[PDB]
Ligand binder design. Structure first.
Ligand SMILES: Nc1ncnc2c1ncn2[C@@H]1O[C@H](COP(=O)(O)OP(=O)(O)OP(=O)(O)O)[C@@H](O)[C@H]1O
Ligand SMILES: CCOC(=O)C1=C(O)C(=O)N(c2nc3ccc(Cl)cc3s2)[C@@H]1c1cccs1
Length: 284
């Protein structure tokens, strides 16, 4: 229903091999959107149509403050256009790099937002499979906006599906079960969460190397260490997430879900109910 001429495009916000995200203003309303533009020729010439379809279908299911929102879709002869919420403050990763690591209050706040987001996503039967700081954006108010759903999976409720078979992810955050059993589950995202918490505190993710195979070897052996100063209750939480057996990670269905995870001592001072309306702590 909307058309390209309905917008004025400004700066490019990001580029992929077959997508470009542009900041746009809608003329009839003056609203700002990040519009993801997919060139049909390239996605066709690379057989990536399924990735585009997956991102659309998954995002259309999401209606929660901690996720990028898909507002509209349209196309023309050359391009698909997806109108998304604009996360003005960019990637969480940028802040980890700039400040080196997060203090305890900021680690707690942003970890709690990620946990709240995963609770919602997993409650909808969706696995992200590529959770990482690059994919956790920050809005103008400094709340999280999780993105990148082309490699997410909607588990079928009709078959009570628990495992997903596509090999997707990012080496530093990929779960041991995907490497060894060749499938992922919702608890695979809790493994990524453990890696992210570790990275917020220590400044680097826990399994790291200059070659992906080396990372895989350490993941499957649970070969990592904590720096000498690491907030102790955060270390305990990481140790309860970075567990090789995906049925034994705090937050997973076999461990009775998000209640016990939200009850962890690292979160004692968190008020879970209105996180998105709280003022985030300043990052410095
Ligand atoms: N909703 C948004 N608000 C602000 N910036 C965004 C938004 N969505 C994406 N970007 C920026 O655009 C860039 C590309 O995102 P896009 O979804 O086009 O591809 P990608 O998934 O990052 O690339 P690839 O598919 O190759 O992994 C990212 O660097 C991201 O920071
Ligand atoms: C409704 C649509 C989907 O659920 C979907 O996957 N669609 C796609 N249409 C095309 C066309 C060419 C290519 Cl190469 C990929 C796709 S994926 C339709 C869209 C229309 C407008 C924006 S998306």
């Amino acid at each position: 229903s909307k058309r390209p001429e309905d917008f004025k495009f400004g700066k490019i916000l990001g580029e992929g091999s077959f997508s470009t995200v542009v900041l746009a203003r809608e003329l009839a309303t003056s609203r700002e959107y990040a519009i993801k533009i997919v060139e049909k020729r390239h996605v066709n010439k690379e057989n990536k149509i399924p990735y585009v379809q997956r991102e659309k279908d998954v995002m259309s299911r999401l209606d929660h403050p901690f996720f990028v929102k898909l507002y509209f879709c349209f196309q023309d002869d050359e391009k698909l256009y997806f109108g998304l919420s604009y996360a003005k403050n960019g990637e969480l990763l940028k802040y980890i790099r700039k400040i080196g690591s997060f203090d305890e209050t900021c680690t707690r706040f942003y970890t709690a937002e990620i946990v709240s987001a995963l609770e919602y996503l997993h409650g909808k039967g969706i696995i992200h499979r590529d959770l990482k700081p690059e994919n956790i954006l920050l809005n103008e108010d400094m709340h999280i906006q999780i993105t990148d759903f082309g490699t997410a999976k909607v588990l079928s409720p009709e078959s009570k599906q628990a495992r997903a078979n596509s090999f997707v992810g990012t080496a530093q955050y990929v779960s041991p079960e995907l490497l060894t059993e060749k499938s992922a589950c919702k608890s695979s995202d809790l493994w990524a969460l453990g890696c992210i918490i570790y990275q917020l505190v220590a400044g680097l993710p826990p399994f790291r190397a200059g070659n992906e195979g080396l990372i895989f070897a350490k993941i499957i052996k649970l070969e990592y260490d904590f720096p000498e100063k690491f907030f102790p209750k955060a270390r305990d939480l990481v140790e309860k997430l970075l567990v090789l057996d995906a049925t034994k990670r705090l937050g997973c269905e076999e461990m009775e879900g998000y209640g016990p995870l939200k009850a962890h001592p690292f979160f004692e001072s968190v008020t879970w109910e209105n996180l998105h309306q709280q003022t985030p702590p300043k990052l410095t």
